[PDB]
Design a protein around this motif. Structure first.
Motif, short mmCIF file in Angstrom:
data_model
loop_
_atom_site.label_atom_id
_atom_site.label_comp_id
_atom_site.label_asym_id
_atom_site.label_seq_id
_atom_site.Cartn_x
_atom_site.Cartn_y
_atom_site.Cartn_z
N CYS A 101 39.37 38.03 42.89
CA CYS A 101 38.14 36.96 43.24
C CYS A 101 38.16 35.70 42.66
O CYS A 101 37.44 34.66 43.02
N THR A 110 37.68 34.58 39.78
CA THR A 110 36.77 34.22 38.84
C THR A 110 37.38 33.85 37.63
O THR A 110 38.37 34.41 37.28
N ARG A 156 39.87 40.00 31.96
CA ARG A 156 38.77 40.28 33.11
C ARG A 156 38.38 41.54 32.85
O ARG A 156 38.71 42.80 32.58
N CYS A 187 33.10 40.55 37.43
CA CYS A 187 33.89 40.18 38.83
C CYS A 187 32.95 39.87 39.81
O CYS A 187 31.67 40.08 39.61
N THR A 188 33.36 38.78 40.55
CA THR A 188 32.35 38.05 41.26
C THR A 188 32.50 38.40 42.95
O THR A 188 32.08 37.80 43.69
N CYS A 196 37.51 43.49 42.54
CA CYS A 196 38.74 43.25 43.02
C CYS A 196 39.77 43.82 42.25
O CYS A 196 39.52 44.33 41.25
N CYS A 247 40.47 42.19 38.40
CA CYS A 247 39.45 42.26 37.59
C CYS A 247 39.69 43.66 37.35
O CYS A 247 39.23 44.06 35.86
ZN LIG Z 1 37.24 40.04 39.99
#
Ligand SMILES: [Zn+2]
Lengths: 754, 576, 223, 77, 235
Positions: free
Chosen positions: A410, A412, A478, A483-484, A490, A493
């Protein structure tokens, strides 16, 4: 259909990827298959003749059975099924008798006692199903617990004692090495490992002797390997070291590439060595290596000479007599307590000294009383030796089942801090379940010096030791909490798959695996506290948290406590009114008047209201708190659950924010979203709030969900996996994802020419 | 006797009947005792029913009180003894007889055979045992056999709970037990007509009928495999409306399509044995059979069950495990006599699981089997001070009784192992530690360490492999829900629960899960298509809609809920 | 250091049914391996000399009683299993046994056909009374080892016949021991003695010679 | 050196996982090729087996050997 | 008796290593003959090896030699790998002398008539710059593996070192057993034997040597009666 069961018996001669299948069972199970082959090879011309030919068990059909069975896997499963390892694939082998022969190493996963347990057998039919059994569910591919990452197929109970005995070192054993002097040369050395065997068969050499020999095929230790070569190796090279002949034969079982070990193969050691192998070698290697430890472990478990009898089980007669003075002194002190010479606390404390005296006395005898070479002690020294929790696991599963990895990254930068074995002049005891198998959100550099590890690294065990040298005391890693990902989570993460030891694969339903990893020990300050946390209920006994930072003034009313926080603003003092003395203060040492306090410290030992810390510290902290509480309960019982499992469950509690008012109703998804507030809600409430109405119906409050769904006239997108299971569709996880179920398989133009 | 309330006024009884039969009960944990008692009432009657070699005082009184043994009512003497009946001529001048239950089936299928222990011209007394019951020998409960035991872990074949036996226990029928099954079928009046059972069957070869008599019921003493015919019955049928392809063969081969359908009793799947007896009840003559029924016939089948790998054994102390393997008597750890041991028990259960008594009856078992003669001439060892007289000496194979809460004490047991007379040619097989040097019967070399050997009393438990093994490829299907079900001729289907579905999801095996829930269980069209596909060798077809889900919609509709499938393109679909 | 003196095998006697055998000289660690190599063969592959099936006129199966007799048919079959026979004729043959009136039926009451013999006539079979008539035939076949009762559905015997478990093993109990002498000055060697006991159907020498022939022909590693 | 695998275990999954993205892709990878091979044994022409088959090798075990040899290429949707 | 089907097959692992498989046996014949084969191959095959040596300069010095890196022990077990077949069948004495710096091999030793060294390239010792070596060797035929005898325990030969004698050419052997279907029952023995050999004789010939010494060994028992009809084993 195409199923069966029977009682299970031990299968010590099986390969890890195999299972004993009663011929009759395999016959009726493969009935349709052997019928086709029986007609093709013209033993019988029409299908009707083939059916009666198998039904009457004609002798000709046994040759056709091994041909249809070959390389055709089966699925074994034993109820209750707790984790995904409760079902595995095996290579069926026709066996005499009516019992199933189960490989002895898989007993741990199935929790299968041989007291008469039964196991079910299912037959995968289609190509996709067979492939899933060969690749996904095969026995030898699933070795590590998908909860702790620890190895499960590691030897146990029989092979442990056997290997312990094989590698043990006995002083003054027959053939013991002696550095002879001035009259003859040393007598303990030996030409090669084979020679020692000939001296062991003859009465010359005891396998547990301290002899020294020169090996030409095993690899030497790391420290000694540099002095000897430092440039070449010993595939054909030789070298000498002093070890038991057994420790030699043991290292032969390991891979050729692995360095010599030379230790008494304690229970704890085998875990270490097996762990190391999984990291450095492929699965097939570890599978075959554990298979070799089984044979050796069993063989020497028989030559171990361990049997119970009158002598070993005998409880020392002296212990019973020594307690008489022990019990008379504890009672004699009680007669003085009534007289008035007791002194009212030392007497009670003194009795513990009496009682403690017996405990010391039993230890004074225990090892001296029973000879060091006692089979009961050897078993101890080696280390060899319901539905209420499954009710919780059901809510866990229903709230996390739709959580699957949906993209590799992701991107992030957000993360969370790990303590990483701090408080050193010293490794934290809980690093293995918080820092292991993570990925760095930001690079880790030790100042002043070079960066120790780059961001996005796997953070394996070898990395921790490398990190330990730098003197680091915190790490950003992570997590699925930060997580975004629009849908699911993901891979980067999430991190390393506990079962595979490598990066998690896209499509893995980490939610269900998480619920199981948490639920299994549920049956094993207990389940009520755990259920109290995941359901987000106000603590049984409430404990206040600090509302603002500053110094603290402590006062004691009658049966009450008053705690005033003098802010560093310094503004309106924060007073915590009435606090039962029964629920004593927290600890730093124990808190006293005038100490500094931060914005979230717990003021008294107890359970802080999760909804309280939410409004105070924000969503990111509530998740850190809940995970700390849940993992503390399981840690109290000695259960190793990686934080990421608990985190997967917690992530689903903060997904919705209340609006109720700029919008019609509250509790809309964070991604779905005019001001709303972060919300904390229990799994049962969170799962009932899912967008699918037939998933919420099959779960709980059936009548309720339909009525509200019929009125609102909702439409289900059939996105979750529960729904598809009901209607018979491919679940959107694993082999069912879009990316994986559209693969086009065509042979390369280059290959067809051949 | 003391009243419950009388306990306040003034200042072995705690043991039950099953619990009072566990020798060395004091040394085993209370929880293990109860577990051991449950397993005593779980045993099955063996053909030979040998009495325990090391027991307690309860066996005698317990056996006769149960009632399954024959006790002489009045003192006297026997007149004639036959397997059928025993008659005793009392001194009083009266005359009493006793018919012996022979091969009577019990509630759970166990055999209830009685045996006569007395002879002609034998004096008898009131309350004396005349014939042995199922699980008794000479009047005391014989729930198992006495076997030679080695407590070494034998190369993982006895791993963690399992057990290995000598092939001798099969050759010598020591653990063999008879089991009897009852089968039933009746002929009554039907809506269409009258049920009729006869030898004539619509479509059969004369070989399947080769074991039937006139009436169509299997003949006594016949051997029956799975699927064979026990009783031939037929019921009316019509209108038939047979398929054209069916009739064309009817005309070609000239076999008239009969007007009745076959409803004949066949032996269930996985059962086999001989036919003991038949009980026929016919309306024609006498026989009050309920309204509608016109005839009834019951078939009794029994089988000798050799002890088989997979069966469950257990001792009186709660230890139980499956028979993991059965090794040929040759390649068995054997004493210096060349005397092979029967079974091999693993040591691993013992560590802090206390079960200590199980090891004591093992040593006392060897003492009772070998005999002893204490060395008391001038010594009179201090350990035998508390002992009674003349127990000092006992011959080989003597029985012993150690009542639960006061039996043989520890010190005495050690002394008894010191006096352990030789085997045929003077030599000692077991030391004062209850151990011996066993020779591995497969390699020939002795086992490097002395191993504990002895005689233990173990039981064959109720549930056996033959009854527990099940398998199914295709069979009957339930009516309301098309999910498979096993009724007659067991063919029952294993049930794939939600927890199993959780694991299947956890692996990510989407297809295996769909296959189990659609084409193996509920797809009325799919299951037949996959069967057709397997036989042709063609790829497996694509699953359809589980009948469970289809029924679900109707259930919602019956509730006044308008469920709409809402396809992306046609927007409205009927399952059809 | 070749100490070459070919092994010497010597007969002996302890009783009539059993007798020792002593073989010397042998190399170190050879007694235990060779001894069990013969024991495993003796206890298994010595041919019999066993009874396959029986047939009583009054009975159709094993689970009934005979008018007058004391033992049931299942307890008579268990008794009949203990008998030790010997047949030098291939091709199954049938014996006969008919007894009437009070008395005790034993193995001696069995009339063996020409070419077979009963070696323990003293054995107790069944006790009959005034009304007891026992008419029974027994089928003797030749084989080795232990074979389960061949059911009469695998072979078309018929309703009447009763299959019985057969045990072709003339050997009763076998053991051994070695007296290897480690000589410090010179000449390390081993020596063993075996103790072969038979069921009276053949002699220890006959059995050991039969086991010897098996292993000899079996060690065909020359190809 | 991972000694010779027996029956089902061969080929090792690790050497197979190099030919695709994930273990789930390997499943569909070999599965669809298995249906391809069995259709060729009956009857839009059908291809394979590209590798010389075994005595009685099952088509699914053939597709696994094919993938191990890089004899085919796949594209994920 | 007529056994259904025996067979024996051979696959070669390396030049001096091979697996042998017997298929199928009759249970439990694998364990019966199995341990007896490994026992015969290891301790029953005739062969020559080194019994005792003596080195110039090493008489009461315990562990060191001048002008050569290798010490006393390292060279003793260096020689234990010397393979030499002889027909003399008595303690012949070979001699090894090489002067100056350089690596001595099993080819530098002069073999008396009747003794033939089979591993010339074998390393024995490395020499110092400006050094010489002279060692005496005693070789006699052997059988099995005889540990190093006490030198004399009598008056003596001063400076005499006995060494462990690897008499047999077979380096080591191990056996396994597996079950294969006979079309009727699963339990049929399969015998796997693993032999690693000296280059004196090949595995194939080494097995036959064990087969002959074993079949003639059991011929005694067969001679007692020779007509008890044991088992045919077909042709
Ligand atoms: Zn993530």
């Amino acid at each position: 259909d195409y199923s069966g069961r029977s009682v299970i018996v031990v299968g010590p001669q099986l390969k890890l990827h195999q299972c004993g299948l009663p011929k009759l069972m395999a016959l009726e199970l493969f009935k349709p298959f052997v019928m086709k082959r029986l007609v093709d090879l013209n033993h019988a011309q029409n299908i009707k003749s083939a059916k009666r030919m198998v039904e009457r068990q004609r002798p000709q059909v046994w040759d056709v059975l091994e041909e249809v069975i070959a390389e055709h896997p089966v699925l074994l499963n034993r109820a209750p099924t707790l984790h995904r390892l409760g079902i595995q694939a095996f290579e069926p082998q026709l066996v005499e008798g009516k019992a199933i022969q189960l490989h002895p190493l898989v007993c741990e996963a199935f929790n299968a006692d041989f007291d008469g347990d039964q196991m079910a057998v299912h037959l995968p039919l289609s190509a996709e199903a067979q492939a899933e059994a060969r690749i996904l569910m095969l026995s030898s591919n699933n070795i590590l617990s998908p909860a702790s990452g620890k190895p499960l197929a590691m030897p146990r109970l029989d092979m442990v004692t056997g290997l312990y005995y094989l590698t043990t070192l006995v002083e003054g054993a027959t053939g013991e090495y002696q550095a002879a002097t001035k009259d003859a040369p040393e007598q303990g050395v030996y030409s090669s490992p084979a020679e020692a065997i000939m001296a062991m068969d003859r009465g010359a050499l005891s396998v547990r002797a301290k002899i020294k020999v020169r090996l030409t095929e095993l690899r030497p230790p790391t420290d000694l390997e540099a002095q000897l070569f430092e440039n070449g190796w010993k595939p054909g090279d030789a070298w000498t070291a002093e070890t038991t002949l057994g420790r030699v034969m043991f290292n032969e079982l390991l891979p050729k590439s692995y360095p010599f070990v030379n230790e008494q193969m304690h229970k704890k050691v085998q875990a270490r060595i097996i762990n190391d192998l999984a990291e450095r070698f492929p699965m097939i290697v570890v599978a075959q290596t554990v298979d070799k430890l089984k044979d050796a472990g069993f063989y020497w478990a028989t030559r171990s000479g361990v049997t119970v009898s009158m002598a070993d089980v005998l409880v020392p007669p002296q212990k019973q007599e020594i307690l008489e003075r022990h019990e008379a002194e504890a009672d004699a002190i009680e007669r003085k307590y009534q007289r008035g010479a007791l002194n009212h606390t030392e007497r009670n404390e003194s009795l513990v000294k009496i009682w403690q005296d017996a405990t010391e006395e039993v230890g004074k005898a225990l090892e001296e009383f029973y000879p060091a070479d006692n089979p009961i002690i050897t078993i101890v020294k080696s280390g060899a030796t319901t539905a209420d929790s499954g009710y919780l696991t059901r809510r866990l599963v229903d709230v996390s089942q739709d959580v699957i990895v949906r993209e590799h990254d992701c991107e992030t930068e957000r993360g969370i801090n790990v303590t990483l074995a701090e408080r050193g002049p010293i490794r934290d005891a809980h690093v293995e379940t918080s820092a292991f198998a993570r990925t760095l959100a930001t690079d880790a550099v030790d100042a002043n010096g070079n960066v120790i590890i780059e961001r996005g690294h796997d953070l394996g065990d070898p990395a921790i030791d490398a990190l330990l040298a730098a003197g680091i005391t915190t790490v950003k890693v992570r997590s699925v909490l930060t997580c975004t990902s629009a849908t699911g989570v993901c891979a980067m993460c999430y991190g390393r798959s506990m079962a595979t030891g490598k990066l998690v694969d896209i499509g893995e339903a980490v939610g269900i695996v998480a619920a199981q990893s948490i639920g299994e020990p549920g049956t094993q300050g207990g389940l009520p506290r755990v259920q109290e946390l995941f359901e987000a209920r106000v603590p049984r006994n409430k404990a206040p948290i600090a509302d603002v930072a500053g110094r603290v003034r402590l006062e004691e009313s009658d049966k009450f406590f008053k705690i005033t926080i003098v802010p560093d603003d310094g503004g309106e003092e924060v007073v915590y009114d009435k606090l039962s003395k029964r629920q004593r203060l927290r600890v730093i040492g124990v808190l006293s008047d005038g100490d500094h306090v931060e914005v979230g410290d717990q003021l008294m030992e107890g359970a802080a209201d999760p909804h309280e810390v939410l409004r105070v510290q924000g969503p990111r902290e509530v998740q850190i708190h809940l995970v700390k509480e849940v993992q503390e309960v399981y840690r109290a019982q000695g259960v190793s659950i990686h934080d990421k499992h608990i985190e997967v469950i917690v992530r689903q509690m903060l997904r919705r924010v209340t609006i109720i008012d700029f919008l019609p109703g509250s509790l809309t998804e964070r991604a779905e979203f005019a001001a709303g507030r972060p919300v904390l809600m229990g799994i049962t409430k969170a799962s009932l709030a899912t967008d699918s109405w037939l998933s919420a119906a099959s779960f709980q409050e059936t009548t309720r969900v339909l009525t509200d769904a019929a009125i609102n006239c909702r439409s289900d997108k059939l996105n979750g996996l529960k729904e598809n299971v009901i209607i018979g569709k491919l679940i959107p996880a694993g082999t069912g994802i879009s990316r994986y179920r559209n693969i086009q398989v065509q042979p390369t133009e280059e290959a067809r020419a051949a | 006797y003391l009243t419950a309330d009388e306990e306040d006024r003034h200042v072995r009884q705690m043991v039950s009947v099953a619990t009072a039969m566990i020798p060395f009960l004091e040394h085993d944990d209370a929880n293990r005792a109860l577990m051991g008692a449950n397993m005593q009432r779980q045993a099955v009657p063996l053909v030979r029913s040998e009495a325990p070699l090391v027991g307690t005082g309860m066996e005698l009184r317990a056996a006769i009180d149960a009632g399954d043994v024959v006790v002489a009512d009045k003192t006297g003497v026997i007149e004639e003894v036959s397997a059928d009946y025993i008659t005793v001529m009392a001194d009083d001048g009266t005359r009493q007889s006793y018919r012996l239950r022979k091969f009577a089936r019990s509630n759970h299928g166990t055999c209830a055979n009685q045996r006569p222990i007395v002879d002609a011209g034998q004096r008898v007394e009131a309350g004396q045992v005349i014939a042995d019951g199922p699980c008794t020998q000479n009047g005391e409960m014989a729930l198992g056999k006495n076997l030679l035991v080695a407590i070494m872990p034998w190369e993982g074949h006895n791993y963690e709970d399992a057990i290995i036996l000598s092939n001798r226990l099969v050759e010598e029928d020591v653990l063999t037990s008879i089991h009897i099954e009852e089968h039933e079928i009746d002929a009554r009046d039907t809506k269409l007509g009258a049920e009729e059972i006869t030898r004539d069957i619509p479509n059969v070869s004369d070989e399947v009928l080769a074991d039937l008599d006139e009436r169509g019921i299997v003949r006594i003493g016949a051997e029956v495999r799975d699927g064979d015919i026990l009783v031939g019955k037929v019921t009316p049928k019509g209108e038939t409306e047979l398929t054209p392809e069916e009739r064309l063969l009817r005309a070609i081969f000239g076999e008239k399509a009969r007007e009745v359908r076959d409803t004949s009793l066949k032996v269930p799947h996985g059962e086999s044995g001989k036919v003991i007896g038949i009980r026929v009840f016919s309306r024609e003559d006498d026989d009050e059979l309920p309204a509608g029924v016109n005839e009834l016939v019951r078939v009794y089948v029994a089988q000798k069950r050799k002890i088989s790998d997979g069966d469950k054994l257990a001792g009186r102390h709660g230890n139980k495990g499956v028979i993991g393997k059965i090794l040929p008597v040759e390649d068995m750890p054997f004493l210096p006599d060349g005397t092979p041991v029967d079974i091999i028990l693993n040591t691993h259960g013992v560590p802090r699981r206390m079960n200590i008594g199980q090891i004591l009856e093992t040593h006392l078992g060897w003492v009772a089997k070998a005999g002893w003669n204490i060395d008391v001439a001038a010594g009179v060892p201090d350990w035998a001070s508390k002992l009674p007289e003349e127990l000092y000496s006992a011959p080989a194979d003597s029985t012993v009784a150690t009542p639960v809460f006061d039996g043989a004490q520890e010190g005495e047991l050690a002394g008894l192992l010191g006096s352990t007379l030789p085997n045929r040619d003077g030599e000692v097989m077991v030391d004062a530690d209850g151990k011996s040097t066993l020779f591995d019967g497969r390699s020939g070399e002795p086992f490097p360490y002395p191993v504990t050997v002895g005689y233990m009393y173990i039981l064959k438990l109720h549930h056996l492999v033959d009854d527990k093994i099940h398998a199914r490829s295709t069979g009957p299907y339930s009516m309301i829900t098309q999910q498979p079900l096993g009724g007659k001729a067991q063919f029952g289907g294993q049930r794939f629960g939600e927890m199993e579905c959780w694991a299947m999801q956890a692996y990510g095996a989407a297809y295996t899960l769909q296959e189990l829930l659609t084409i193996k269980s509920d797809d009325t069209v799919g299951r037949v298509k996959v069967y057709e596909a397997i036989v042709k060798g063609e790829n497996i077809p694509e699953p359809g809609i589980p009948e469970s889900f289809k029924v679900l919609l109707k259930e919602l509709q019956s509730l006044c809920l308008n469920v709409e499938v809402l396809s992306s393109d046609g927007a409205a679909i009927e399952m059809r | 250091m070749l100490i070459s003196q070919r092994p010497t095998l010597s007969e002996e006697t302890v009783a009539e049914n059993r007798s020792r055998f002593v073989i010397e000289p042998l190399e170190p660690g050879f007694g235990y391996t060779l001894g069990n190599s013969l024991r495993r063969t003796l206890l298994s592959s010595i041919p019999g000399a066993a009874v396959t099936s029986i047939r009583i006129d009054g009975v159709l199966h094993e689970f009934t009683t005979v008018p007058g007799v004391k033992e049931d048919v299942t307890d008579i079959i268990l008794n009949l299993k203990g008998l030790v026979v010997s047949s030098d004729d291939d091709e199954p043959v049938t014996m006969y046994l008919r007894k009437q009136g009070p008395g005790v039926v034993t193995a001696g009451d069995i009339v063996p056909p020409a070419g077979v013999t009963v070696h323990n006539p003293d054995m107790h079979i069944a006790t009959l009374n005034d009304k007891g008539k026992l008419e029974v035939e027994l089928v003797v076949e030749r084989g080795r080892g232990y074979v389960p009762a061949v059911q009469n559905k695998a072979s078309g015997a018929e309703i009447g016949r009763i299959p019985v478990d057969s045990i072709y093993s003339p050997v009763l109990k076998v053991t051994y021991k070695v007296e290897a002498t480690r000589v410090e000055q010179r000449t390390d060697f081993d020596k063993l003695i075996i103790d072969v006991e038979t069921k009276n159907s053949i002699s220890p020498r006959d059995a050991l010679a039969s086991a010897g022939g098996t292993l000899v022909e079996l060690f065909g590693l020359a190809r | 050196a991972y000694d010779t695998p027996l029956g089902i275990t061969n080929p090792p999954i690790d050497e197979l996982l190099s030919r695709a993205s994930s273990k789930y892709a390997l499943v569909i990878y070999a599965a669809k090729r298995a249906r391809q091979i069995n259709d060729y044994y009956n009857q839009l022409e059908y291809v394979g087996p590209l590798v010389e088959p075994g005595l009685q090798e099952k088509p699914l075990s053939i597709a696994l050997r094919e993938i191990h040899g890089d004899l085919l290429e796949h594209t994920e949707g």
